[PDB]
């Protein structure tokens, strides 16, 4: 019911990787924005994303991360400054 970057990222990632676990944490409030720009600039600039999906099986880290970056290329071109990624398989996780 809110059309924003977080929702787009969740939709895209969940659709493409069908993760069993998907954490999308906005930490932009620590690293960006200002009251002089508020309401007129994109404040969704910094994200920590954890994705636990079976699609990562047999992938080295570089390939997993390249995949995720590829899926979020539009966001990186339209306001997303920093994207931190943890990409695991369910076996690699609790």
Curated annotation (Swiss-Prot):
Q: Which UniProt keywords apply?
A: 2Fe-2S, Chloroplast, Iron, Iron-sulfur, Metal-binding, Plastid, Transit peptide
Key word Acetylation present: no
Spell out the subcellular localization from the entry.
Answer: Plastid, Chloroplast
Q: How does it assemble?
A: Interacts in vitro with GRXS14, GRXS15, GRXS16 and GRXS17, but not with GRXC5. Interacts in vivo only with GRXS14 and GRXS16.
Q: Could you tell me what this protein does? A: May act either alone or in interaction with glutaredoxin as a redox-regulated transcriptional regulator, or as a factor regulating Fe-S cluster biogenesis. The glutaredoxin-BOLA1 heterodimers bind a labile, oxygen sensitive iron-sulfur cluster.
Q: What else is known?
A: The GRXS14-BOLA1 apo-heterodimer model derived from NMR data shows a domain arrangement totally different from the holo-heterodimer showing evidence for a Rieske-type ligation of a [2Fe-2S] cluster.
- Report what the protein is called: Protein BOLA1, chloroplastic
Which organism does this sequence originate in? Arabidopsis thaliana (Mouse-ear cress)
The shown residues of the full protein are 64 to 157 of 160
